[PDB]
Amino acid sequence: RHKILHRLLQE
Amino acid sequence: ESADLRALAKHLYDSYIKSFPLTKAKARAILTGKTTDKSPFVIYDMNSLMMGEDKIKKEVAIRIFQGCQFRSVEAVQEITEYAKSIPGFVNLDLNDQVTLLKYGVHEIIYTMLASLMNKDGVLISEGQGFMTREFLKSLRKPFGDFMEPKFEFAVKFNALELDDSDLAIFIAVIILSGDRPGLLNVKPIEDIQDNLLQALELQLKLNHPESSQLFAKLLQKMTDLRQIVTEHVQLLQVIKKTETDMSLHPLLQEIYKDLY
DSSP states (O other): OHHHHHHHHHO | HHHHHHHHHHHHHHHHHHHHHOHHHHHHHHHTTSSSSOOOEOOOOOHHHHHHGGGOOHHHHHHHHHHHHHHHHHEEEEEEEEHHHHTTTSSSHHHHHHHHHHHHHHHHHHHHHHEEETTEEETTTTTTTEEEEHHHHHTTGGGGGGGGGHHHHHHHHHOOOHHHHHHHHHHHHTTTTTTTTSSHHHHHHHOOOOOHHHHHHHHHHHHHTTTTTHHHHHHHHHHHHHHHHHHHHHHHHHHHHHOOOOOOOHHHHHHHHHHO
């Protein structure tokens, strides 16, 4: 869950 | 000491400038006329909206709402890059970074939307449109009620006369709120916030030495912001239910589900 938020953070 | 806090203020300001395309400085230059740029196309009604498709990117209320939706997603992305520049943020537990953004981004969206607003309307598409307040109220319900509380808030908030360099620190303080539901490890969040809050206070004394207790006025507004956010989640809860011909963007779905 929060895959996009995770993706934006890990970028 | 003072010097360290000034360096934090400046690091954040530089980072704010990079992360956010349209600053409050540009936005005020546009709104008062003092820029030498082409004035924003004014959208005061159904026809002007229609003629103004060329300057911006099913039924009207719904199309506006979905435009507002596109821009939010970009804001969330800009705010996320800005957070990652707040010293110590990326060293937090990743689930805590997520929680902080989840609960913070709309509070920063309303803070920063006020930069784009006067009592009559709001700049859109990076200052090249200007959508009037009466037009947004005139929308059929529930869409008429959507933006008006953001205008009410902006009007009071804009009275504090903050600039970009103040706002850069204020926004960081909001993101590092140790009382967000579900945080795993509060103490390191609070340690960073304590440091930002001292940096904000020093900044407000230096940059507005004739304004006394701006710092205190500004903290009181951090609670106003949670209201407008809760009020906003519930109107969106209503819109999710009473409307069908429109899907919420997935990123905004992440943020809003299990929220306040």
